[PDB]
Amino acid sequence: GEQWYEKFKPNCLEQVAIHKRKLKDVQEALDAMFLPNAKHRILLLSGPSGCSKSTVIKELSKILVPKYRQNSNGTSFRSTPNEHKVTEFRGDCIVNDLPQMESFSEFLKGARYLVMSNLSLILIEDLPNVFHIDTRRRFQQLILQWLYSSEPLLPPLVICITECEIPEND
Amino acid sequence: MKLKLIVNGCEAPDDYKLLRTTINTVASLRKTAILRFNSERLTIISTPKSSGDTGQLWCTIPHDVFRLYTVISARELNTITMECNCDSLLSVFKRYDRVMNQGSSSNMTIKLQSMPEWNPICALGITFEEIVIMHSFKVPVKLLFRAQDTRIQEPMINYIQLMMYKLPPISGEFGSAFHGFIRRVERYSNVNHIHLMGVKKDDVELKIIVNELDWHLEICWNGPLDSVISSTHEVIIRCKDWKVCSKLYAAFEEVVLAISHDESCVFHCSLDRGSKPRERGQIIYYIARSKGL
Amino acid sequence: LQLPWVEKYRPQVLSDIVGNKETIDRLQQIAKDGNMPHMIISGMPGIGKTTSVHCLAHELLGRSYADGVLELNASDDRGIDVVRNQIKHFAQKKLHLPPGKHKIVILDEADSMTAGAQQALRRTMELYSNSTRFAFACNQSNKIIEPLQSRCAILRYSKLSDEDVLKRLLQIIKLEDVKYTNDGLEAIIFTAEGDMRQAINNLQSTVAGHGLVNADNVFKIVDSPHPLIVKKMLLASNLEDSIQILRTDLWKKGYSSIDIVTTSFRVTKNLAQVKESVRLEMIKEIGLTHMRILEGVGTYLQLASMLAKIHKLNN
Amino acid sequence: SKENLPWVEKYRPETLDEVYGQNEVITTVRKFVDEGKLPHLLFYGPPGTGKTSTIVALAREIYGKNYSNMVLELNASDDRGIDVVRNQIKDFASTRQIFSKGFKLIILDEADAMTNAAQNALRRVIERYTKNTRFCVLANYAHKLTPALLSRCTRFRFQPLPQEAIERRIANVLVHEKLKLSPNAEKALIELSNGDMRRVLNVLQSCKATLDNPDEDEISDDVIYECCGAPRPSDLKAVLKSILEDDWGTAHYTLNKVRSAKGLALIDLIEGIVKILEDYELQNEETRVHLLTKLADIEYSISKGGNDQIQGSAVIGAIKASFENET
Amino acid sequence: MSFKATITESGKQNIWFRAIYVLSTIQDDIKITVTTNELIAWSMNETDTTLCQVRFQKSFFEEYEFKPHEIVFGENGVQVIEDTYGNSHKLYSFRVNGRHLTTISRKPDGDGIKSFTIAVNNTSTCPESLANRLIVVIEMDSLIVKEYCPQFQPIKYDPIIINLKYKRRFLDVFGLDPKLLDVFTNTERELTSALFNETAADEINYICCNSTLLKNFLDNCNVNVTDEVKLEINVHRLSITAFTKAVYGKNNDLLRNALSMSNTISTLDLEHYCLFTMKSIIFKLKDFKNFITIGPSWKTTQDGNDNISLWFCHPGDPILMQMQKPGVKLELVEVTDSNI
Amino acid sequence: LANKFSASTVHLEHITTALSCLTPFGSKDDVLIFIDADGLSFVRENNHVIKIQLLLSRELFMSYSYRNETEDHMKLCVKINHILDSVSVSDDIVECTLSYDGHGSPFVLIFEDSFISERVEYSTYLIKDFDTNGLELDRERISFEAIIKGEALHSALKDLKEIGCKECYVYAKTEANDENVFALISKSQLGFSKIKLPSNRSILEKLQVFDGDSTTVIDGFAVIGFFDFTSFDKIRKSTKIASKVLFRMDVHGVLSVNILSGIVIEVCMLEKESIDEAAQTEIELLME
Numbered sequence A: 001g002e003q004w005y006e007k008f009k010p011n012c013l014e015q016v017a018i019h020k021r022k023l024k025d026v027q028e029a030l031d032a033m034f035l036p037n038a039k040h041r042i043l044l045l046s047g048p049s050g051c052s053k054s055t056v057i058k059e060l061s062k063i064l065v066p067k068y069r070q071n072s073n074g075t076s077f078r079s080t081p082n083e084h085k086v087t088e089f090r091g092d093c094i095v096n097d098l099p100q101m102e103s104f105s106e107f108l109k110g111a112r113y114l115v116m117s118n119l120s121l122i123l124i125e126d127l128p129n130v131f132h133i134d135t136r137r138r139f140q141q142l143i144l145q146w147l148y149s150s151e152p153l154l155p156p157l158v159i160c161i162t163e164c165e166i167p168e169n170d
Numbered sequence B: 001m002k003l004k005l006i007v008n009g010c011e012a013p014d015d016y017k018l019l020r021t022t023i024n025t026v027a028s029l030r031k032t033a034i035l036r037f038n039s040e041r042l043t044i045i046s047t048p049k050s051s052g053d054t055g056q057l058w059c060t061i062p063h064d065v066f067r068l069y070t071v072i073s074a075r076e077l078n079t080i081t082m083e084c085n086c087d088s089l090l091s092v093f094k095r096y097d098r099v100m101n102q103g104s105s106s107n108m109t110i111k112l113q114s115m116p117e118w119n120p121i122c123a124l125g126i127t128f129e130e131i132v133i134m135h136s137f138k139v140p141v142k143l144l145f146r147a148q149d150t151r152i153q154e155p156m157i158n159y160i161q162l163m164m165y166k167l168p169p170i171s172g173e174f175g176s177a178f179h180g181f182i183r184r185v186e187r188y189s190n191v192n193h194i195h196l197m198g199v200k201k202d203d204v205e206l207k208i209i210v211n212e213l214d215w216h217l218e219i220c221w222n223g224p225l226d227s228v229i230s231s232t233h234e235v236i237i238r239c240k241d242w243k244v245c246s247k248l249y250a251a252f253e254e255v256v257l258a259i260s261h262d263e264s265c266v267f268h269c270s271l272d273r274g275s276k277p278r279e280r281g282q283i284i285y286y287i288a289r290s291k292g293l
Numbered sequence C: 001l002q003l004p005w006v007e008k009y010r011p012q013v014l015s016d017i018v019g020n021k022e023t024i025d026r027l028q029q030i031a032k033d034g035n036m037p038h039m040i041i042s043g044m045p046g047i048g049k050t051t052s053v054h055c056l057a058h059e060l061l062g063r064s065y066a067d068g069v070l071e072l073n074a075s076d077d078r079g080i081d082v083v084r085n086q087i088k089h090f091a092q093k094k095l096h097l098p099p100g101k102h103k104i105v106i107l108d109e110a111d112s113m114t115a116g117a118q119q120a121l122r123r124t125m126e127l128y129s130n131s132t133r134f135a136f137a138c139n140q141s142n143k144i145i146e147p148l149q150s151r152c153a154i155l156r157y158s159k160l161s162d163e164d165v166l167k168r169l170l171q172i173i174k175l176e177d178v179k180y181t182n183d184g185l186e187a188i189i190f191t192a193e194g195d196m197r198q199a200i201n202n203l204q205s206t207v208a209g210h211g212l213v214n215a216d217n218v219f220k221i222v223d224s225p226h227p228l229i230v231k232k233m234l235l236a237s238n239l240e241d242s243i244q245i246l247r248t249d250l251w252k253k254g255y256s257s258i259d260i261v262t263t264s265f266r267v268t269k270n271l272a273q274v275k276e277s278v279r280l281e282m283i284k285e286i287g288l289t290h291m292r293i294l295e296g297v298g299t300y301l302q303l304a305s306m307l308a309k310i311h312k313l314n315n
Numbered sequence D: 001s002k003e004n005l006p007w008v009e010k011y012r013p014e015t016l017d018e019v020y021g022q023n024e025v026i027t028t029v030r031k032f033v034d035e036g037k038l039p040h041l042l043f044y045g046p047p048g049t050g051k052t053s054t055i056v057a058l059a060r061e062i063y064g065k066n067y068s069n070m071v072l073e074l075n076a077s078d079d080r081g082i083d084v085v086r087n088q089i090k091d092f093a094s095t096r097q098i099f100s101k102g103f104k105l106i107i108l109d110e111a112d113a114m115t116n117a118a119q120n121a122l123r124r125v126i127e128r129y130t131k132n133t134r135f136c137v138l139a140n141y142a143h144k145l146t147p148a149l150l151s152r153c154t155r156f157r158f159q160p161l162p163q164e165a166i167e168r169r170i171a172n173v174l175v176h177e178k179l180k181l182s183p184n185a186e187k188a189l190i191e192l193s194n195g196d197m198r199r200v201l202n203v204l205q206s207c208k209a210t211l212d213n214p215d216e217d218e219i220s221d222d223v224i225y226e227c228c229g230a231p232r233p234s235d236l237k238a239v240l241k242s243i244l245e246d247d248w249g250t251a252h253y254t255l256n257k258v259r260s261a262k263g264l265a266l267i268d269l270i271e272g273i274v275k276i277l278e279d280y281e282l283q284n285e286e287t288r289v290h291l292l293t294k295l296a297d298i299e300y301s302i303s304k305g306g307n308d309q310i311q312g313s314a315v316i317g318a319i320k321a322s323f324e325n326e327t
Numbered sequence E: 001m002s003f004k005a006t007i008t009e010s011g012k013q014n015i016w017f018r019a020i021y022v023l024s025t026i027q028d029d030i031k032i033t034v035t036t037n038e039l040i041a042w043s044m045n046e047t048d049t050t051l052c053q054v055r056f057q058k059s060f061f062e063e064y065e066f067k068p069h070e071i072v073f074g075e076n077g078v079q080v081i082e083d084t085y086g087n088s089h090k091l092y093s094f095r096v097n098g099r100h101l102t103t104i105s106r107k108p109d110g111d112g113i114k115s116f117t118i119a120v121n122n123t124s125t126c127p128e129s130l131a132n133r134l135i136v137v138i139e140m141d142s143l144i145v146k147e148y149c150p151q152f153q154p155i156k157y158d159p160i161i162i163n164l165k166y167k168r169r170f171l172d173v174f175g176l177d178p179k180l181l182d183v184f185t186n187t188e189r190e191l192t193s194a195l196f197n198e199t200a201a202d203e204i205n206y207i208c209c210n211s212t213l214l215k216n217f218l219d220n221c222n223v224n225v226t227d228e229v230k231l232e233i234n235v236h237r238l239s240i241t242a243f244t245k246a247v248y249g250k251n252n253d254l255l256r257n258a259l260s261m262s263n264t265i266s267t268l269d270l271e272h273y274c275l276f277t278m279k280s281i282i283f284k285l286k287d288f289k290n291f292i293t294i295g296p297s298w299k300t301t302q303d304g305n306d307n308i309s310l311w312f313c314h315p316g317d318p319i320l321m322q323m324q325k326p327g328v329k330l331e332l333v334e335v336t337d338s339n340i
Numbered sequence F: 001l002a003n004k005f006s007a008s009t010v011h012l013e014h015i016t017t018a019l020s021c022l023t024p025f026g027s028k029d030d031v032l033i034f035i036d037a038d039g040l041s042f043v044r045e046n047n048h049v050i051k052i053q054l055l056l057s058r059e060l061f062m063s064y065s066y067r068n069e070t071e072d073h074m075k076l077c078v079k080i081n082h083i084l085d086s087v088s089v090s091d092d093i094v095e096c097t098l099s100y101d102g103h104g105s106p107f108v109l110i111f112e113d114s115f116i117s118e119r120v121e122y123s124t125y126l127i128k129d130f131d132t133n134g135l136e137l138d139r140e141r142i143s144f145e146a147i148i149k150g151e152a153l154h155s156a157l158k159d160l161k162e163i164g165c166k167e168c169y170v171y172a173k174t175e176a177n178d179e180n181v182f183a184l185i186s187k188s189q190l191g192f193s194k195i196k197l198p199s200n201r202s203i204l205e206k207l208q209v210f211d212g213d214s215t216t217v218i219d220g221f222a223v224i225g226f227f228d229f230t231s232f233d234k235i236r237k238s239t240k241i242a243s244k245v246l247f248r249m250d251v252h253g254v255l256s257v258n259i260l261s262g263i264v265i266e267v268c269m270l271e272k273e274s275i276d277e278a279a280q281t282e283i284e285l286l287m288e
């Protein structure tokens, strides 16, 4: 019943259909972004459909996040070690007391807290409704504020954009 | 540069109401307002040109309102010009109003402070008590340059082509009737541009019209309207401006109206105070021709 | 008022669909196995795409068709909010279907959905693919964004052959006991141009209007297709013959100049009989005539001049 | 009263019996309604052929006095966006019948002006609600209609009205309102109508207005041409003969006199000359090519407005040069 | 009926509706866990930075029946948890759209509700149409009856024990005013009754404060402006400030203005305060602002007053807010900043 | 007065309340006004599937003058831009007068106060060829008829409006031992919800399910009518002021609602073309 492309998913970084040079470049960039005071704050990955952007990002996160994540002293939510290497934004979440355009903001204002003992890689693959002009402007303003922010610590931010054409619609 | 103001709502309620009205009016028109603190009076300005088109609001408050009024600066007349977000001051003023309503004699203290933690940008440290809980608000504000302050000027209205209209006091027997007259047109959905007209010879009469290919609204006034010491004077104005004028009229008593034919509308409000008599605080609203004849 | 035969005799099982035998057999195997993946069915209008999808869903579900199918369409709202609420809740719904079956979301005419709706569909399919499957039906496959295509198997339906149309028409006639001949059925097939719905409609109109099905009777209800007349007009040896065709068969029959120019361009695009340069010059002249018509001069003289220029180019 | 209305509306057919020139379509629709097997209809044709009149008369016949609430009519003048299709038409087509009068009809007049999204939404509405709902789509340009909508509607082509139908309708109009029309005047009216009944009625009304006393005065060809302002055939023949036989100066003088005596327009003259030349004997194709191309270019230039004398001289020179190819 | 519960008090209906509305505010889908003793409605945001829990005791409902053994449909929601005392607890957890539950639980404008029933039926004799659907029956005082069957998706429950650890640390460090001893005993009883388990690195700070002051301050706060909330505690005063950080662009241009709104009180006003020996903590404001409003909805006069308890530790560690009602327990966990 | 039709009254509140029932029928539509010696009739028709007719009696108007002896009634049409708000209205009494002088003259409404004089003119329009009287209930064959209190029906309609109802089902059933069932079943994003009225006389008074004949009453047959909630919610405002509501379903499927508050409102709405199998199955399950 399970589709093969889901059944036969990579279990390690060595099974990802990615070229050696691109993989090494991504590793170096992501490792640099994880440093205490990293010059780079956002990793913008752009490519066609099904080129293993999210796959390689998740595989690298599974190895990197445990290395830098500061050990906790019993402050974890549950008894589990909080297997949340990647925190992703869901664009179809509709909470009760919140305007739609403010959804992504509410995500970002939370994502800032996932640092040090709560370290987590922030992945943005499911973008908000950027086709709405106001939503796109708010998204751009929030990204700029993240880039120009003035906090001593921020979590690595990864934005994976699948470049594709928009067919002419009536 | 030193700024220190102390306000007490219990003492001199009329001037406190004047300040409330000015703050509410400026916050109900735009996002930011200009505050000029002078050695003699405080000016609050809401104008499109900041640091037909929309109207302008100018409020003058005498220095005698504030129990303590220390305004020191290196500029002429110790003038300090600031640009402040209307929403923040308005929220602080609601907080203070509800605190006073709960019952207290606390005084609101306003000071200007420099913010190194954050065109220099400073803060207003509005502090008041509540019986005790200390309420403090650091409202961001922008210090405005002398030349930029000089750029903003009061609009001038010709006094030969303008005729003043005296309105009945809100506290009088005709006050409720005139308030209802004013609000008559504030209940029609698609109406956006009203047409005020004044006819001389009731010595004078004021009418409100709305002309449309399908609709014809026309409201007359039959009460005694006096003219402050030729009969065709009409002006088209937006409904928001008329609503602002309606709200303003409900607070003051010596309200004056003026219509510069096909030019503009002027709404003047003054607050008499006993003592010679003290300086009379004023609120002047200028509305430009929305469409015109 | 009996229902038209286009709907009265709509196939209910996939075995009753004629043409595209390979894809229909594949769909039958899918229904038998039950492991239906995400799919996109594309093809010409009126060839059995909606019917095929509905028959597959019926065969797969059965008693659970009502609770396991969420049919959305152009007439129904299909905005981003719809994907956010209705499709999301349907996908989240937990059913108790047999072991090898999944809920089916039929997005008929999916080539008209908004870009934001498709972007949200990306995530809803990425998350709810374990129990929900999507069967997009469209005319152009490229109208679906590539991220959605990546997860869907593509089935392109071919134009119906004459044999399949004749077989289905004969079955319908036998069921309805309609009197028919050979020339009438040949004319119906020729005018169908691979669209079975059009064939059935023309047959019904002819029988109801004139009774017995004949070549003349069919021609009365249905005229010769416009593209073939246009192609004959374009492919001519003498300018006089082309002018005669344009006047008698097109202008006097009540065809607008704009329609004639558009069909001429479409025919010249797919014509393969002359060199590239000749076709290019014909397209150029057709475009100039289309320009001159769009500005208000939709006169017969413009079409005559276009034909004259095309003929000069041919020589 | 109806006397105030223009003849184009006063003489609007009230029953299908008054519809002329569409005998095959009329008979087919009669059989459909009699047998209760009316399919989705697509009336495609040029302006003023009787599509709106035919569908209105059909609706009257099917229902009668209930036409108000049995038929929903939408045209270009009304809003016909995707939202309208999704709400108003869907609600109308998804409701039961007032008196079980067969079915509910939807007349989408001038549907060729509808948006592509609206047509896409309407296709499935048409398919879903067909047991007790019917659709009629009137159009003058088919290429603006989506292929699926064309496939799902049975197409009826409204040909230009034949001469006999227009003569019958003119006779009916004359009988209804006392007036006399000469046979030559009737022939000229038919020729200038080009299969349009609206033009026929408008020209007849304006020609009655032209006559001093419309009681004993008979309409003549001269009156028709004066009212319409179009050239008479004799003028076209004379100018063509002068152009093809006389010199440049003589041809210029003849054209100027012809177009100044009655203030004729050059567009009408060019169209008449084109029609005359279309039925002549030509021994070479290049002559026809030159004539057609140059005349089409001159009409295109005239459409944008320019120097009248330049365009007239251009027509004369184009004709002379093209006819030089012969022999 | 696999699960049945009913509410017949106006104030209880108000508090239930407010709790459901808040939970729908945190997360689009609310998680409802049914046990033999309590009903837990909880939510957590996508970032995993806030967790809201509302536990209604069986006493909160006049009639409460739980028969997990009858459940057949949606068997994946049934779960079993071991107990330290050699006991097994059986629970059933599902996920329900929060907006729908809120729109079902609202009090009608003008009319009054006499009974509010929530039931889950997944027994052997369960109609297929009534499978994996939560049954809600609302009776009006005018004898009108409304029925709802919103969909629910079975899920598994992962208990959160951060509060247990914070209580353990608080008792170990700070364990005189009799009220403080009563609070200590209550915390010990809570730790013991729970079916789960229990220097300079043992930082722990506790503040019990009358909810009236904080509620009044937070009602005026606007989340659209003052995103962050900072608590400063001294030995002499407590200050709570809703604030925002200024952001500067390319040419030192304000990308987002900074505003502050602070209220300060003396430690004598506070009900209780215990510090590890100026301690400052920072976190988000929206969830706290919405959470502080659930308790007052019932408007009870007996038992204890509406007091909110706060537990916090080093920056970056979670902060825990707790409130209690005669038959309800409200808990909020948030993630704090780790700048210092 | 020197006009064909001239009415004047002081009970402006009643007229405003009655006219406020015409809001839900949209703002791009038109209102037909029938003038007659009996009184005033206000007619609105929407989508050719719903119609409302409000009657104002002569006794309500303090003074009434109908001098158009040539015709027993006058028809006129007015565009509903914001006329609902115009007739909406302190301490002093306000006199409302309506004036109309034949076709081609504006419909004039004048409010007279102690010191304020209002006058509003409405232009008339060509009467649509569509007959607003085409939708009516056949009294010979009534599937069922019911009497309900206005308050309960208004509460039920508000409840359906809150949940964003998309489709509505009117279910009526009469059984032995005085068993009466009237229910509204809403299909919406919530799924299928049911609101059933009680058998108490104070709320639900008296019921018949005739099965079509209006003479014989049978027990056991259930009448189900399927409606679009867009049309069904247009009577909520009329029901808010209602004191009694009379429901009637015929065999043809037309729903008639009589609203009594001395102002009577008659509403007719059509039933949807067909019922889906899933909806019928859910109805059967809910009613078992």
Ligand SMILES: Nc1ncnc2c1ncn2[C@@H]1O[C@H](COP(=O)(O)OP(=O)(O)OP(O)(O)=S)[C@@H](O)[C@H]1O
Pocket: A005, A006, A008, A009, A010, A015, A016, A017, A018, A048, A049, A050, A051, A052, A053, A054, A055, A056, A161, A162, C146, C147, C150
């Ligand atoms: N060896 C493999 N390497 C990479 N991906 C694989 C492999 N085998 C299976 N996959 C799956 O193939 C899919 C494509 O990888 P993705 O990273 O999701 O594509 P993408 O770059 O994200 O493009 P989009 O934006 O998701 S359409 C994923 O679902 C993977 O799990």
Ligand SMILES: Nc1ncnc2c1ncn2[C@@H]1O[C@H](COP(=O)(O)OP(=O)(O)OP(O)(O)=S)[C@@H](O)[C@H]1O
Pocket: C005, C006, C007, C009, C010, C011, C016, C017, C018, C019, C044, C045, C046, C047, C048, C049, C050, C051, C052, C138, C168, C196, C197, D148
């Ligand atoms: N291959 C076929 N075999 C038999 N009947 C067919 C076939 N294709 C079409 N038909 C008939 O034509 C009717 C319409 O076919 P559809 O499948 O609805 O059209 P379509 O291919 O979906 O085109 P679109 O996408 O709706 S524009 C069906 O109900 C059948 O009666």
Ligand SMILES: Nc1ncnc2c1ncn2[C@@H]1O[C@H](COP(=O)(O)OP(=O)(O)OP(O)(O)=S)[C@@H](O)[C@H]1O
Pocket: D007, D008, D009, D011, D012, D013, D018, D019, D020, D021, D022, D045, D046, D047, D048, D049, D050, D051, D052, D053, D054, D139, D140, D169, D197, D198, D201
């Ligand atoms: N067959 C006909 N018989 C009699 N009168 C006709 C006929 N066709 C048209 N007319 C007249 O011309 C008018 C044209 O009416 P329509 O039926 O709207 O024409 P049309 O074909 O719809 O043109 P378009 O496509 O809408 S521009 C009618 O009102 C009649 O007065």
Ligand SMILES: [Mg+2]
Pocket: A053, A054, A055, A125
């Ligand atoms: Mg991916």
Ligand SMILES: [Mg+2]
Pocket: C049, C050, C051, C108, C109
């Ligand atoms: Mg289809």
Ligand SMILES: [Mg+2]
Pocket: D051, D052, D053, D109
């Ligand atoms: Mg027409």
